[PDB]
RNA sequence: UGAAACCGUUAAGAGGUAAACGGGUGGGGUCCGCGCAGUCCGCCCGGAGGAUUCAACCCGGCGGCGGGUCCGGCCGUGCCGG
RNA sequence: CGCGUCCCCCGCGAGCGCACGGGGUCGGCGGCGAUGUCGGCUACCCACCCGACCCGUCUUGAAACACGGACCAAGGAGUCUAACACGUGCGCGAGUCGGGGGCUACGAAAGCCGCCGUGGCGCAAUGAAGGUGAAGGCCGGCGCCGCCGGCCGAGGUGGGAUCCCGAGGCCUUCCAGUCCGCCGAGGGCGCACCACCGGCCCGUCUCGCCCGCCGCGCCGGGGAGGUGGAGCACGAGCGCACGUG
RNA sequence: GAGUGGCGCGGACGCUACGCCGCGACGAGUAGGAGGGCCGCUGCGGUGAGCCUUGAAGCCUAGGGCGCGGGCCCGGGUGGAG
């Protein structure tokens, strides 16, 4: 129920949203995972440009 | 940046510039006084009248 | 100096309180070298603490 | 203040070397524990 | 070489000292003149009556300038209009007292809060002890005791009310600065009547305590003061 | 039993700043001393403003410290601000200004000082003028803030030109029934 | 900080600051934006006027880049180019005017709000307002169109 | 400065010791040993310390020198006074009055030294 | 480790208005003060003692300071010259 | 209660001491005490006097013949996430912010990027939309009218904290006379803010005349006066944190 | 308030300025709101040259206290590792 001058706001949480919560504890490990692969590729494409 | 550049308000407040432009310190402490009566105390009545 | 002692460090006997040492210290490879430096800068009483 | 004193540099034996660094303006930044 | 400023600081102290003596003598002689007034005031009312009585006529004396209003009822279960008039009289507590000078804009207020006040025409001795014993001044909106004349002289000195006696003269002989002299006085914190109230709820006429008691406020002022 | 309403017998002003910063709190200790001791009513108003919240001392734009100092009978006078001086970029020429502010934005510093102006703090304003004599005490616009457009008479009340709280404005976000004679009514 | 909160000062009470008569029940007004035309009408009328109903034409596949036209006023037109140019414009003898490419700095229209300082310009702006034209011509300049 | 690094220390120093509705300061050069601006023995330019000797008997007087204050090692000159009580309490009065060296701590230093010479006096 | 409810036993106390309760004292305890000749502190006045023993005076040392205006450094959210 | 002098009827003497004098002292004393007495407000048990119904709860009202509770231990209930609002703290400030990406034990941290500011929000609004999109008056060249020209030019009124000016006056055997400080009749600049009046931009309506041109039209621009707008009128926001709803 | 004019080496306390001091007035309270906790709990970063097998936590108590209160500190007994 609206109390006073508020914003007529509509949250999109009427579905079973808690099942499909994508958390980002992967992020710092992912940035290392991508970086390790980027290095290992650059050393493979040996005298060639790293960026492609 | 600094909000104030001289942080020492020991030296600022006893600088000749500030000390010149104050009033006199009212350091004397005035406690409450008893109400003596007209007919009880004669020389309280001699002070008022 | 006052803040570092209020933080709790035993710097009573430290030389200067921005304790800047030579770049010979970055050449060190053993702890016996690292110990002797902190004895001579008199930071060791903080390691002892 | 805005003065920057002449910071000595100490030899590995704990005694003063000849060299002096000027105290960086970093060390005269406002002390805000907040 | 300090020989100047030694004596100059004494010359100040003597000028401060001799000035208080002149102020003391004024306070002494203003007090002696009001004695001479109160005599002539008290005497001429008996005089005008005797010459009325000799001729066979009546001296209807001056309808009184000055009333002393005491709140007799409590703070609980009170009308909104009665609450307002009692708190414009500064009677915000049971057995609080204020002097209220009579007119049309006084009595039509006092008759509207009749059941909650015992009031009447105070004496000279009643105005004395109320000002001497129970005398407190509203100085910096604080209830400070009138123990030296320099508290009345500092607040009321701009109206030439410069001692305890000038205040009493200003109240009793309702002066041109009665308002400022009476509003200076904090509403008097009087004790419960030592002897007993007759009946709080009913009017004084019907063997009660409430309303106008013309000469008889003074008996209960001495019962309460 | 005294009929006193204890509703309004606590005054709800600041008697210190809520901030715990020690450069602002040392400025208060200085103007605690000056305000009560110096009879000047300047230092009292400054002390009050040193307490006040971020919103209550809003940023005075440089182009107000131009305009309100250009005014007649204000030559060789120091503009005193308890907020901050922000560099207004839609002013071109900048005069010599004597400035007292808690902060100055790094743009407005380089603007004022280059144009033969001087910037002070409140420890300096103290040593220069302890009574704050020969000072223009300025303030930024307090009703400047976006928040005051939503305040007052409610939006959807006759002759209330008040901004409503809308998620995101457009053509189909509170435009119909209470805003058009075609759709129901119009306030 | 759970310790700074109101919940900690409501240990020892009973209702936990939600009334003794009207208890903290689950949804006693309906969920979300319910009763907007029924029992929450007065809130919606007083605070959200226009909420119910249609207006205007539906535009199905609206792309926000076709209707991209970011505007700069004449108030801050000189801030697009370096302060050196405004200095070098006045002092030099030729009467050469500096070019303010308004599209280079990322605006497509020049609106005419500010007092424009009395020295010439050439403004290579994509669109112009009618006043913004008159102000630049008044100071003595060009309103060069560009695409 | 003194008034600055007080506002950091006042509530969060390692020497500050709060319990039993009482506050103290266990600093090397606090005398009266209480949490104060005046008596704080780190934060002022001029600081008077009164400590008992490294041997059994006497009082050492720690005068914080004016020059090297960012130099912790050379910042204090220590002078041990092993004399009679009346002339120990005199020497400390003369070090403070007749050098003008922080004269607010003139009487506190004499009261401390007095309570140190009383301490190292044998109990019956 | 061994809490409370609850029970036993021992010790002390009391018991016809169910018990318990608040306020006010009295009584008996258990324990404590580890009570039970009852404060130290200056300064001064007298007595009989002791001690390497003050003021002053040099001599080296160390610090504070201001020297209206000694010399030289060094730093400038200070400029003005190349 | 002097006189050195100014006239209406005939600027500081020294001491002493008592006190109905800005809240109590005595320069008065007196019994007692090592195996049985001294102190101990509380706490243990008991007795007496007065008071005294059983709590939680919904309720107009509960000690209720209203409901829950035999007793004790442990467990046990306004959370976290998202959004929004407003207050407050911090940073920067017409900007602001890397949050996504990238670069280099604690550390899955921290530090850095700016030709990573894409993008978000703010800096511009209004309109259904096409779209449009935020001061002027003067002095002249042809008692005027659109070009030609020139300088100064972001309102006004009222109230306004703060400053500003200073008619006069604040004393040592005079009296002039200057430097500072302080007070002040009265007078001005007026911050923010508020009310008011005019202005400007967008929508629409009414009345009306004049401009522009590679494309002279069912073209484009402009004016005076009403009115609709979540606007302008020398920016305040952005990020973060905390609190409450 | 300033200028040229006619012997004895001495003086309490204080001011954690978020501190300290002074003076007047006032004090019911459910729902409810706010403030202050040197109130308590369990973990983290600091710090206290903290305490602890010469005895930690816990637990018991007719022991001594403190605080308006939430609670807390001591003494004794038990206990064995924080």
From Swiss-Prot, chain D:
Location in the cell reads: Cytoplasm
In the record, which residues are listed under signal peptide? none
The organism's superkingdom is given as: Eukaryota
**Family as reported in the entry's similarity comment:** Belongs to the universal ribosomal protein uL4 family.
Q: What is this protein called?
A: Large ribosomal subunit protein uL4
Q: Which organism is it from?
A: Oryctolagus cuniculus (Rabbit)
In terms of the parent sequence, the fragment covers 2 to 35 of 413
* Quaternary structure and partners: Component of the large ribosomal subunit. May bind IPO9 with low affinity. Interacts with RBM3.
Q: How is it modified after translation?
A: Citrullinated by PADI4.
**In the record, which positions carry N-acetylalanine?**
1
Curated annotation (Swiss-Prot), chain E:
Residues bearing N6-succinyllysine? Answer: 104
What the entry lists under InterPro entries is as follows: Ribo_uL30_ferredoxin-like_sf, Ribosomal_uL30, Ribosomal_uL30_CS, Ribosomal_uL30_euk, Ribosomal_uL30_euk_arc, Ribosomal_uL30_ferredoxin-like, Ribosomal_uL30_N_euk
Q: Which residues carry this modification: N6-acetyllysine?
A: 101
Q: Which GO terms describe its cellular component?
A: cytosolic large ribosomal subunit
Which cell locations does it reside in? Cytoplasm
Give the Pfam families listed for this entry.
Answer: Ribosomal_L30, Ribosomal_L30_N
- Record GO biological process: maturation of LSU-rRNA from tricistronic rRNA transcript (SSU-rRNA, 5.8S rRNA, LSU-rRNA)
User: What GO molecular-function term can you cite, just one?
Assistant: structural constituent of ribosome
Q: So which domain of life are we looking at?
A: Eukaryota
Q: Which residues carry this modification: Phosphotyrosine?
A: 116
Q: Which UniProt keywords apply?
A: Acetylation, Cytoplasm, Phosphoprotein, Repeat, Ribonucleoprotein, Ribosomal protein, RNA-binding
Q: Which family does it belong to?
A: Belongs to the universal ribosomal protein uL30 family.
User: Whom does it interact with, and what assembly results?
Assistant: Component of the large ribosomal subunit. Homodimer. Interacts with DHX33.
According to its UniProt entry, the function of this protein is described as: Component of the large ribosomal subunit. The ribosome is a large ribonucleoprotein complex responsible for the synthesis of proteins in the cell. Binds to G-rich structures in 28S rRNA and in mRNAs. Plays a regulatory role in the translation apparatus; inhibits cell-free translation of mRNAs.
Descriptive protein name:
Large ribosomal subunit protein uL30
Instruction: List the source organism.
Output: Oryctolagus cuniculus (Rabbit)
Swiss-Prot record, chain G:
Print the keywords alphabetically. Answer: Acetylation, Cytoplasm, Hydroxylation, Phosphoprotein, Ribonucleoprotein, Ribosomal protein
Tell me which Pfam families the record gives.
Answer: Ribosomal_L27A
> Which residue ranges have biased composition labelled Basic residues?
1-29
Q: According to the UniProt entry, which residues carry N6-acetyllysine?
A: 46, 54, 109
Question: Cross-referenced InterPro entries, in alphabetical order?
Answer: Rbsml_uL15_N, Ribosomal_uL15, Ribosomal_uL15/eL18, Ribosomal_uL15/eL18_sf, Ribosomal_uL15_CS
GO cellular component terms, alphabetically, are:
cytosolic large ribosomal subunit
Quote the subcellular location field of this record: Cytoplasm
(3S)-3-hydroxyhistidine is carried by which residues? 38
The terms under GO molecular function for this entry are: structural constituent of ribosome
- Name which cysteines form disulfide bonds: none
Residues found modified as Phosphoserine = 67
Region Disordered: list its residue ranges: 1-36
Q: Which HAMAP family match?
A: Ribosomal_uL15
The record describes the protein's role as: Component of the large ribosomal subunit. The ribosome is a large ribonucleoprotein complex responsible for the synthesis of proteins in the cell.
Subunit and partners: Component of the large ribosomal subunit.
Q: What is this protein called?
A: Large ribosomal subunit protein uL15
UniProtKB/Swiss-Prot annotation, chain H:
Broad class of the protein's primary localization: cytoplasm
Biological function: Component of the large ribosomal subunit. The ribosome is a large ribonucleoprotein complex responsible for the synthesis of proteins in the cell.
Subcellular localization is given as: Cytoplasm
Any matching Pfam family = Ribosomal_L28e
InterPro entries the UniProt entry points to? Ribosomal_eL28 (IPR002672), Ribosomal_eL28/Mak16 (IPR029004)
What protein name applies here? Answer: Large ribosomal subunit protein eL28
Q: Report the residues modified as N-acetylserine.
A: 1
- Single GO molecular-function term? structural constituent of ribosome
Question: Which key words are in the record?
Answer: Acetylation, Cytoplasm, Isopeptide bond, Phosphoprotein, Ribonucleoprotein, Ribosomal protein, Ubl conjugation
Species, as recorded: Oryctolagus cuniculus (Rabbit)
Q: How does it assemble?
A: Component of the large ribosomal subunit.
Q: Which GO terms describe its cellular component?
A: cytoplasm; ribonucleoprotein complex; ribosome
What is one GO biological process annotated to this record? translation
Q: Which residues cross the membrane?
A: none
Modified residue annotations for Phosphoserine: 114
Family to which the UniProt record says this protein belongs: Belongs to the eukaryotic ribosomal protein eL28 family.
| Cross-link type Glycyl lysine isopeptide (Lys-Gly) (interchain with G-Cter in SUMO2), residue numbers | 57, 64
């Amino acid at each position: 129920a609206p109390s006073r001058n508020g914003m007529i706001l509509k949250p999109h949480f009427h579905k079973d949203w808690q099942r499909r919560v994508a958390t980002w504890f992967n992020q710092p490990a992912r940035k290392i995972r991508r970086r390790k692969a980027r290095q290992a590729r650059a050393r493979r494409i040996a005298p060639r440009p790293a960026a492609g | 940046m600094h909000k104030m550049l001289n942080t020492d308000l020991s030296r600022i407040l006893k600088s000749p510039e500030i000390q010149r432009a104050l009033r006199a310190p009212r350091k004397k402490i005035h406690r409450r006084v008893l109400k003596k009566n007209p007919l009880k105390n004669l020389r309280i009545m001699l002070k008022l009248n | 100096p006052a803040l570092v002692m209020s933080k709790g460090h035993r710097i009573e006997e430290v030389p200067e309180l921005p304790l800047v040492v030579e770049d010979k210290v970055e050449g060190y490879k053993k702890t016996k070298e690292a110990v002797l430096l902190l004895k001579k800068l008199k930071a060791w009483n903080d390691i002892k603490k | 203040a805005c003065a920057r004193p002449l910071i000595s540099v100490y030899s590995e034996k704990g005694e003063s070397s000849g060299k002096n660094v000027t105290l960086p303006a970093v060390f005269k930044a406002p002390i805000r524990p907040d | 070489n300090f020989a100047e400023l030694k004596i100059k600081r004494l010359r100040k102290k003597f000028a401060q000292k001799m000035l208080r003596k002149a102020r003391r003598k004024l306070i002494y002689e203003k007090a002696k003149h009001y004695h001479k007034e109160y005599r002539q005031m008290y005497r001429t009312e008996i005089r005008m009556a005797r010459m009325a009585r000799k001729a066979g006529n009546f001296y209807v004396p001056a309808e009184p300038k000055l009333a002393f209003v005491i709140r007799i009822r409590g703070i609980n279960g009170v009308s909104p209009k009665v609450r307002k008039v009692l708190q414009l009289l500064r009677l915000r507590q049971i057995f609080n007292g204020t002097f209220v000078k009579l007119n049309k804009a006084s009595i039509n207020m006092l008759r509207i809060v009749e059941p909650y006040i015992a009031w009447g025409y105070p004496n000279l001795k009643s105005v004395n002890e109320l000002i001497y014993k129970r005398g407190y001044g509203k100085i910096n909106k604080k209830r400070i005791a009138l123990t030296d004349n320099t508290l009345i002289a500092r607040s009321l000195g701009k109206y030439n009310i410069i001692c305890m006696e000038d205040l009493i003269h200003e109240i009793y002989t309702v002066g041109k600065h009665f308002k400022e002299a009476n509003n200076f006085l904090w509403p008097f914190k009087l004790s419960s009547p030592r002897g007993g109230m007759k009946k709080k709820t009913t009017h004084f006429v019907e063997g009660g305590d409430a309303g106008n008691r013309e000469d008889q406020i003074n008996r209960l002022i001495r019962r309460m003061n | 039993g005294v009929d006193i309403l204890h509703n309004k017998d606590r005054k709800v002003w600041r008697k210190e700043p809520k901030s715990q910063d020690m450069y602002l709190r040392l400025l208060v200790k200085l103007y605690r001393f000056l305000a009560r001791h110096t009879n000047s009513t300047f230092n009292q108003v400054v002390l009050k403003r040193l307490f006040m919240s971020r919103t209550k001392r809003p940023p005075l734009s440089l182009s107000r410290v131009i305009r309100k100092m250009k005014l007649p009978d204000r030559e060789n006078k120091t503009a005193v601000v308890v907020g901050t001086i922000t560099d207004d970029v839609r002013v071109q020429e900048v005069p010599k200004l004597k400035v007292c502010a808690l902060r100055v934005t790094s743009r407005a510093h380089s603007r004022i000082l280059k144009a033969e102006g001087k910037i002070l703090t409140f420890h300096q304003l103290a040593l220069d003028s302890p009574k704050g004599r020969g000072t223009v005490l300025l303030s930024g616009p307090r009703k400047g803030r976006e928040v005051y457009q939503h305040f007052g008479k409610a939006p959807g009340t006759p002759h209330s030109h008040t901004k409503p709280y809308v998620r995101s404005k457009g053509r189909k976000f509170e435009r119909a029934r209470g805003r058009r004679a075609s759709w129901g009514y119009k306030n | 900080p759970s310790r700074l909160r109101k919940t900690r000062k409501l240990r020892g009470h009973v209702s936990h600051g939600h009334g003794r008569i009207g208890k903290h029940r689950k949804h006693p007004g309906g969920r979300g934006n319910a009763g907007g035309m029924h029992h929450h009408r007065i809130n919606f009328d007083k605070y959200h006027p226009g909420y119910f109903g249609k207006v205007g034409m539906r535009h199905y596949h609206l792309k926000r880049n076709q209707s991209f036209c970011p505007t700069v006023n004449l108030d801050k037109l000189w801030t697009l180019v370096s302060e050196q140019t405004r200095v070098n414009a006045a002092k030099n003898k030729t009467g050469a005017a500096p070019i303010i490419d308004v599209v280079r700095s990322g605006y497509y229209k020049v609106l005419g709000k500010g007092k424009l300082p009395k020295q010439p310009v050439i403004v290579k702006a994509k669109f112009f307002s009618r006043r913004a034209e008159e102000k630049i011509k008044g100071v003595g300049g060009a309103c060069v169109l560009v695409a | 400065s003194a008034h600055l690094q007080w506002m950091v220390v006042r509530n969060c120093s390692s020497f500050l010791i709060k319990r039993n509705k009482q506050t103290y300061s266990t600093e090397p050069n606090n005398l009266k040993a209480r949490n104060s601006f005046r008596y704080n023995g780190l934060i002022h330019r001029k600081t008077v310390g009164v400590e008992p000797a490294a041997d059994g008997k006497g009082v050492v007087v720690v005068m914080k020198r004016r020059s090297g204050q960012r130099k912790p090692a050379t910042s204090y000159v220590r002078t041990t006074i092993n004399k009679n009580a009346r002339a120990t309490l005199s020497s400390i009065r003369h070090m403070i009055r007749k050098n003008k060296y922080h004269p607010d701590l003139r009487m506190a230093a004499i009261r401390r030294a007095s309570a140190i010479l009383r301490s190292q006096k044998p109990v019956m």
